[PDB]
Amino acid sequence: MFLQRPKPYSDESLESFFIRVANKNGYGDVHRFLEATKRFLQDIDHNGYQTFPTDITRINPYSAKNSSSARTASFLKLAQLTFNEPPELLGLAINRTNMKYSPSTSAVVRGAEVFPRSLLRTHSIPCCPLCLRENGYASYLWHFQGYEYCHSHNVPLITTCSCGKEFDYRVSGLKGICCKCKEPITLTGHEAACTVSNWLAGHESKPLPNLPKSYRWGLVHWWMGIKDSEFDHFSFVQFFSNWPRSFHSIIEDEVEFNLEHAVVSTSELRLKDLLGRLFFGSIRLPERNLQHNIILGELLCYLENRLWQDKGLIANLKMNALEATVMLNCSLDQIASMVEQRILKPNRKSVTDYLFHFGDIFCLWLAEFQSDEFNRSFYVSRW
Amino acid sequence: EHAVVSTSELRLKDLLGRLFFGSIRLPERNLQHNIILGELLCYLENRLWQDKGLIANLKMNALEATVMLNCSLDQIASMVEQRILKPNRKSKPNSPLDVTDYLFHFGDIFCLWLAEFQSDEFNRSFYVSRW
Amino acid sequence: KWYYKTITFLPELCNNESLAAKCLRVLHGFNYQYETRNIGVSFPLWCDATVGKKISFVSKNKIELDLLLKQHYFVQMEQLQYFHISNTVLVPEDCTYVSFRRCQSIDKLTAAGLARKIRRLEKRALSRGEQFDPSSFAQKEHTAIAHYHSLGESSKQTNRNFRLNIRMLSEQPREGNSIFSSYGLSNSENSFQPVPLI
Amino acid sequence: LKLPTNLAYERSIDPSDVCFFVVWPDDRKTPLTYNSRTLLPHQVDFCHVPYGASHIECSFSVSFSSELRQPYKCNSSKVKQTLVQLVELYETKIGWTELATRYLMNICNGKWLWKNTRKAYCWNIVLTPWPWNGEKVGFEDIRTNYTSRQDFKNNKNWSAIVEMIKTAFSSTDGLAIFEVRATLHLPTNAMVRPSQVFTNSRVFQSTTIDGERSPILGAFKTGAAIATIDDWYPEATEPLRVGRFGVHREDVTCYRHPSTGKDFFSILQQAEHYIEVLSANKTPAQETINDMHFLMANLIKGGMFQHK
Amino acid sequence: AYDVSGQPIKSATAEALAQGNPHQVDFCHVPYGASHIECSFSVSFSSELRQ
Ligand SMILES: [Zn+2]
């Protein structure tokens, strides 16, 4: 077929795009448009023949398992074969990514910005009914569990109306009419969260840092890592209100409590015991880019300055080899090659046993593994 | 023009070999900075399906998939037992993973980079919105 | 007075049919560059499975053989040592003459060729005012065809992908007429001509 | 729920071979013929639409039947009861309309014409059900109309047909026979793709019409096409052919692998649970009725659920 | 895929259950144009049950 695209926005969810291209060219309901594109990918031979989605809830490639490749191929073809001028149709698609967030949690990228999977709204996605009525599209940010207020209207997102006891634009139609009753849907620490949600979009907020909008969600997921659940925006904004002070107090308080409450004595004390949760819960956010990963930056700065304070109690913390492979991106293979080459000091002679200290490994990362962005010079010239 | 092989077996190693695998990690594959990998990928994407899939149907080996999109051949094994990949030839018994035989198509690995592997900065949206 | 210059393909992984087809492409471009037609081709290893590693250019003319063999494409795949060029040699002892002929009657056997044939037939018969029924010209149920090889080819003036269905038939060196098809093959309508299979 | 040593179900959907015919502008039908080229013995076959052929008919006959009500064998009646009651309670709680619809859709749009519609101008499915009182029920231009379940429901005879199918699936001895004819249109000299025979070498599976041989899509290939309903599975993307472990053929690996608890014999091990889940006056979850839909379709396909 | 006592098989991977195995069956079916199927036989009742 041949279609025309409407006024392409930058921050507009893929489903919103398909809605406003279906109801623009020739189709009454977007479902019909999905079957139309499926027939299109039938006509021109393809692989999205089979797995192209016809329900709007599962368009983004992260929905299809072992078919995301085919769906992105499909979006690529659509983008240069079915429009008067090519749209940026693939950049809006929320698809998986290989990179993780610090504790064993996967991530999904959209455009140039990668979010943690931990906060994705697998269901019941809210909406800014006003923004729906004015702009006519659904912003992507509504899909994530941080964006709880419209950064443009400072209103809490309407997840359930009165007529529609649960609402989503993916079935509504980018207009204010509920599922059961046809009527305008528009109804309704506010600022403590409005600033956070505005900062989640690419923007600035006074207490929160100017990280890339991929590392902001990293901050949020890390905060939920400390606050065992329940991301609240107020504690976040006040924690970044005194930034170099609060986090230093936190690592001090966590570090001092661990050293008293440790059950085994000092020399055999390990670093997953002392500084256990902070260090490895910040090491990989979007990535260890120390310029952006402000948390790991500050933690490494604080550790470097106090590396030798008390008998080098920090420096002589036993970390197992596998934790060295995390401290500095490496393979157990390569650290093995390093220690047999006599680069590292396996205090006892002779592989997942704790045989290396922190200090000898920290200086090792300084010497032989300091990357372009996983780089020391990014944090030393900080506050 | 001077390909000693037919097109259905034309690989990516020979056709467009030195350029691609010579620009894949200049310092690291940040497509905002690694401008030449960015433009090469833009050029290839804009001509994926031009002549009955000339670029698209380019044979690629596992040890080339592992460098076009960061992962270990064991992770590729995990991607191909999950059938996220399309091993155009059948290895019937018990999946003996041959990491050297040209087995995937470049287009179907470019698309597999576009979802499942578009990392923080190794991202498509860096080059498409350019000149 | 048969000069010949062989070419053997070096790369141990190479589809010989494609390389031979490109050699014939450039030979055809030559034969249309200079209106010469006196360079025939031979495949000294016309195996069952494939055309062999070699394609030889045979001619009664001596200057045209090496004029062709130093064309741009050949020198190019020479410096990349894909090809091996020999020298312009004669050969009177290899009387094992054959005829590599473009067996055109093989293209009238594919369904899209039978369609062409029937369309032409009825376009003729209706001009002759005769009654043509395209419902009788049923496809043959079993068409076993002799062994042959196919070299894909295209035309610059009108884009299409045809195939020289080249087939090697034994023969005796009855006479040197010194005329080959533009693709360097012997064809029955032009002066049929055998070639020394080196 | 243990799996007995003799359990077997006879199949309900019984399709026939799909025989092709060629209709000339004089409106007489001659069966298709296919070249069988052989190089000198791989014998690759070639079936293309003849030159002047106006269009091409594809006829077959599919019979729905109530052979799923009672297991064809149960060496232990204790399990026969929990399956006949399973079928009864399924039919009562969630009627046959979903399985019946998802079968009749594959019948009424060209899906048994597996690949022969990639390049087709239009194909019309005319349908003659046997226990019928009206005229023939005809769907036309299936890529212009009848593209989604709703368009099917919009045809004036659709409800009657689905009613007949769910009857055949409901009655103790009901059946419903449909003779389906697809007047398919292909471009001039287009490729028809009958079912290859199991043995490059492409040799067609074929029959003999008017004494001379013609290509066919097998009865089992067609039965496989009608049973591409299984969209209920983990992360379901596109329908599968109903199977004990939802297998795919293009990308070999098999979804519903018994490692996951969504294969057949795993959700049969919980048939006793499903009986009481249905028996409640409240409606069951969507996922559990998807599990039971797959279970019922796997019974309709019939087979051997034994462990010797 | 299962062994007795309901335990999955570690060697029956999702690629092993997907391998299509072939069978061979004899297939009889009415020819296309054939109107109907005659079926003929002869049954003889006798009094071989008296003695
Ligand atoms: Zn808004």
- Torsions phi, psi for C129 (to 5 deg): 65, 0
* Beta strands in B12-108, from DSSP E residues, in sequence order: 59-60, 104-105
Other C-beta atoms lying within 10 Å of the C-beta of residue D258:
22
The answer to whether residues C166 and C98 touch, using CB atoms and an 8 Å cutoff, is: no
A95 vs B49, B118, B121: nearest CB: B118
- Dihedrals phi, psi of A41, to nearest 5 degrees: -65, -15
Q: How many helices (H) and strands (E) does chain E have?
A: 0, 2
| Distances from the Cα of D247 to the Cα of A66, B54, D199, E19, angstroms | 14, 32, 21, 9
Rounded-to-integer distance, Cα D15 and Cα D217, Å: 11
CA distance D170 to D87: 9
- Chain A residues with CB under 8 Å of a chain B CB are 61-62, 65-66, 68-73, 76-77, 80, 88, 90-91, 93, 95-99, 109, 111-112, 114, 214, 286-287, 289, 371-372
Half-sphere exposure of A31 (CA within 13 A, CB side): 10
CA distance E51 to chain D (A): 38
User: Hunting for tokens 């009664």 — which residue is that?
Assistant: C60
Q: Which of B49, C8, C54 is nearest to A77 (CA)?
A: B49
Chain B residue with minimal CA distance to A214? B120
Neighbours of A139 (CB within 10 A): 23
**Helices (DSSP H) in A4-126: which residue ranges?**
14-25, 30-43, 48-51, 68-81
Among candidate residues A107, A120, A119, A89, the one with its CA nearest the CA of residue A10: A89
Where does B19-119 show beta strands of DSSP type E?
59-60, 104-105
Amino acid at D67: E
Inter-residue contact A241 to A288 (CB < 8 Å): no
Pick from D69, D18, D52: nearest CA to D186: D52
Name the closest residue on chain B to residue C82, using Cα atoms: B4
Tell me if chain D has a CB within 8 Å of the CB of B9: no
D208 to chain E: which residues are within 8 Å by CB? 31
For chain D, what is the radius of gyration of the CA atoms?
21
C-alpha span between A191 and A193 (Å, rounded): 5
Quote the CA–CA distance of D106 and D127 in Å, as a whole number.
13
CA C162, CA D117: separation in Å to the nearest integer?
A: 27
Chains touching chain D, criterion 3+ CB pairs below 8 Å: A, B, C, E
**Residues in chain B closer than 8 A to C13 (CB atoms):** 4-5
Instruction: Report the largest interatomic distance among the alpha carbons of chain A, rounded to a whole angstrom.
Output: 77
Residue A132: which of A182, A88, A91, A186 has the closest Cα? A186
Q: How was this structure determined?
A: cryo-EM
Which DSSP category does C138 fall into?
A: P
Q: Name the residue among B61, B103, B65 with its Cα closest to residue B86.
A: B103
Q: Record the tokens describing residue A55, joined without a space.
A: 């329900």
The tokens for A20 are 């406003």
What is d(CA A149, CA B24) in angstroms, rounded to the nearest whole number?
Answer: 41
Residue length of chain A: 383
Q: A306 is written with which tokens?
A: 């106090």
CA distance, residue B89 to nearest chain A CA (Å): 17
Q: Cα D108 to chain center, whole Å?
A: 11
How many angstroms separate the first and last alpha carbons of chain B? 29
Residue D158 dihedral angles phi and psi, to the nearest 5°: -70, -45
CB within 8 Å of D281: residues ≥ 6 apart: none
Distances, alpha carbon B52 to alpha carbons A47, A321, B57, in Å = 14, 51, 9
The count of other CB atoms within 10 Å of the CB of residue B12 is 22
> How is residue B97 annotated by DSSP?
-
Contact C183, C24 (CB under 8 A): yes
How many Å apart are CA A143 and CA A123, to the nearest integer? 9
Sheet-wide strand order for C97-102: C149-154, C161-170, C97-102, C195-196
SS3 content of chain A, % helix, strand, coil (to 5): 40, 5, 50
Question: What does the block give as tokens for A147?
Answer: 């964006």
Whose CA is closest to D110, among D98, D96, D99, D121? D121
Which residue has tokens 């940040």? Answer: B30
CA-derived radius of gyration, chain E: 25
Report the C-alpha gap between C125 and C108 in whole angstroms: 19
**Rounded distance, CA D284 to CA D281, Å?**
9
Q: Residue A320: phi, psi to the nearest 5?
A: -65, 155
Distance CA A77, CA A75 (A): 5
Of C143, C141, C144, C165, nearest to C153 by C-alpha is: C165
- Confirm if A132 and A174 have CB atoms less than 8 A apart: yes
Q: Which amino acid is at D261?
A: G
Any idea what DSSP says for residue E45? -
> Is there a contact between D34 and D47 (Cβ–Cβ < 8 Å)?
yes
What are the respective helix, strand and coil percentages of chain E, to the nearest 5? 0, 10, 90
Angle between helices A14-25 and A30-43 (to 10 degrees): 90
User: C24: alpha, beta or left, given left = phi > 0 and alpha = psi -120 to 50?
Assistant: alpha
Question: Is the distance from CB of C114 to CB of D38 less than 8 angstroms?
Answer: no
The strand ranges marked E within D149-299 are 175-184, 206-209, 212-217, 228-230, 240-241
Can you tell me the distance from the alpha carbon of D153 to that of D158, in angstroms, rounded to the nearest whole number? Answer: 6
Are A365 and A329 contacting, i.e. CB atoms less than 8 angstroms apart? Answer: no
- b/e map E17-39, b = 16+ CB within 10 Å: bbeeeeeeeeeeeeebeeeeeee
Residue C7, phi then psi, degrees to nearest 5: -140, 125
C-alpha span between B35 and B16 (Å, rounded): 17
Query: Three-class SS of residue A106?
Result: strand
For A378, the enclosing helix (H) or strand (E) is helix A377-380
